[PDB]
Design a binder for this molecule. Sequence first.
Ligand SMILES: Nc1ncnc2c1ncn2[C@@H]1O[C@H](COP(=O)(O)OP(=O)(O)O)[C@@H](O)[C@H]1O
Lengths: 429, 143, 286
Amino acid sequence: AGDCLLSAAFIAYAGYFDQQMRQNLFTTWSHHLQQANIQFRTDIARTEYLSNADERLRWQASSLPADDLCTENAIMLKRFNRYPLIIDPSGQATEFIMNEYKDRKITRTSFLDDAFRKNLESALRFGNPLLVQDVESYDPVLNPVLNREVRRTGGRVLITLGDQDIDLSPSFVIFLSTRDPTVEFPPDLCSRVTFVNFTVTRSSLQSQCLNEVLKAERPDVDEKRSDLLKLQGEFQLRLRQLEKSLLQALNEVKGRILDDDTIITTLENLKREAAEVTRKVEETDIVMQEVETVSQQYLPLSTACSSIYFTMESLKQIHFLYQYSLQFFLDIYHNVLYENPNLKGVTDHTQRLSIITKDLFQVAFNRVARGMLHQDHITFAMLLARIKLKGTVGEPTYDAEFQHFLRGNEIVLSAGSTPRIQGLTVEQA
Amino acid sequence: LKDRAATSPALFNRCVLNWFGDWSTEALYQVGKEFTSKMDLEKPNYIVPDYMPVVYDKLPQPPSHREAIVNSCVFVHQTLHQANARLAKRGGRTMAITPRHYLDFINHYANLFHEKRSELEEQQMHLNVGLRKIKETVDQVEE
Amino acid sequence: PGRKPLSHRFLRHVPVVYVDYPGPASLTQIYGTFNRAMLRLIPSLRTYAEPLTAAMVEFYTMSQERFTQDTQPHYIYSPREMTRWVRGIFEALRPLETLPVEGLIRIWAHEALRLFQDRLVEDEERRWTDENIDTVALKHFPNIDREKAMSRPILYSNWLSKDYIPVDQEELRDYVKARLKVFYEEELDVPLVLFNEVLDHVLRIDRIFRQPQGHLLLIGVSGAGKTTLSRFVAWMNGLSVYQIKVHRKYTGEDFDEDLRTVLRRSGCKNEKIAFIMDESNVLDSG
Ligand SMILES: Nc1ncnc2c1ncn2[C@@H]1O[C@H](COP(=O)(O)OP(=O)(O)O)[C@@H](O)[C@H]1O
């Protein structure tokens, strides 16, 4: 009861918020439910409760990033009542949904197209998906479609799309998308669509980078995290598959006793896999106790990565030419991970993390500054130094000192400004 | 409305404006209670140690966990309203949340609850069928 | 806003007269005559015409002093509100006789809430209006029974009886469910739960539809039910709802033709039209 409550509250309400806000919403709802003793199971995974193995696998096959935000967006996209409105500055979501609907012949159309109505009426009759981009100029003829106000009272299900009436095919699904990362929408359109937001955020970078470094460094914790996820149902799914295989074998052999090994092998395999699942469940206390330690060990690297990328993104303000995309930072990160010349020999993890962090800082500075004027190298270099200083823990953040260094000399006062020693001037005083 | 009046002065001359407020906690509680009725949320074993109402007025007595479910749904709506307010206060680009969001949330809850009860019931009956088959195999072995 | 200052070249040829809001004494003299003329259907309450006008003017001025246009752009309080107040009270006394003072001040309070509170935005404003309508009622009528207000849901409807008798919450709710059964049978099988605000809004839209010049400005969040309630109460009063099907290529002459069609239906064939529009329906200032 409470578990589906949380899942549906996440699906219908969240979707426009970023990963941090989605998680804050979910943890607040979970705290409220547990405080009222609405029994919901802890250590929940939204992704695998709202999807199974084959759906996720086909999603990854059809060009879906491995990030959890993309998986939750795909979950919101498979099951929805209000037709989704996609927010993605880049195009992975649009190509994802084009791939997910090749077999149903999804038509690509835009509101700016003069043939939008012609492409929409034919799509709605034929019953094939239609994906419409550039929702900035949303066309008000879709209001009956988004409202689902089709009149079923008549013999055939006719929708009053415009002046004339068109029969609504049951397989018609419309998709809306935009190319702009963030823009205001009219509330009337807002109430008729499920905002699914692929826009990337500091928390999204932190999660992506943490996942990537955990896959690269210490693959064992990543594989046992995957196993922890598989503990929610899909291992039980394979359990049920072996159960039905045993049931088929039982009446395939008709209870043969002369050759019993045919069923003894299956029974032994079932016993072994049951023991394995029991061991995994009983280790759920030991795991997520060292997994959390490992994840927190790799957290400074991820927060440094997010800070570095968003400093690069904000470098637009310094100069118009300083234009860097997310793919450029992803290339920098993949370079510091999978082809470092400094990581060939060192195998200890605590030293490997230091090398990765240091070289990530260095490669970011090199790649960014190579396309910067020789008056901003110090600016980027010392912004990176500030990021590293917040990264390290041996010394304080020195927030007050930086704030003074930046803007505290603008404090207005005229008391005691007279120089006292002969070796001093008024501005120095 | 400021420039809607300027474009057409007759909007405040011949039209008696009726302001619709956002659905109050009572309205949300009533919608949730009525729509989550086909759902079977009746749990005989349920204990309430604390006091966390949102509706505050009707049926504050120890609930049957159905009042608790609807109370939690209304709290979800209120919490998203607080989330929007905090996001606007500490930044910008917030989005209006309508009663249609509440209706969509209740529909999602109903459908997901139905699916996740039906799948468990069907796997349980499959398990019982397998148990009966194993008993039949035991009978064959005894023979 | 929207008032462009006139050019001095034209302004010198036209003298201008400043017509301000009538003062409390002028308002009292204006509407005391109206109250005395209205109360001729009930000789039993002639002595209460003076305090009725006193309370009307005092409440109107009190709501004029605060809750001005600074907070919201639609907080316009004019003697037109007083005129509508008098017209509503008079229409609520046309078929009705032998009314006690409690019933008269009940009608007064109902009209004051309909013309003074349903416009307010915040709940604090609404409860301020309720508290001060109660306090002015008790100040200008210190010798009345709690029949004046009883439960705060002051409702008037002409559905249960021929006249415009006040109705109870539960009976009206049951009647609205009964009519919603047939409404669903006709169309919109979607369920509509009837909470207090829904009944209040339905009654307000009905009383607007009663008058010949009834025009509405239903302002509220999307999905609050403004359109559904509008069509429901339009059917419940036998008005044919007409909507504009708006798209991008929907031009000005299309709107002109739609206006021509709706006016032909309204005038010719004597068909009552509940023609409704939304903000998404408007794309041109024309
Ligand atoms: N009192 C109510 N109970 C249940 N549902 C309602 C209620 N009022 C409105 N709705 C729902 O709102 C939807 C349409 O809302 P609408 O009338 O378009 O609001 P608005 O006109 O303010 O956008 C309908 O599908 C209906 O189910």
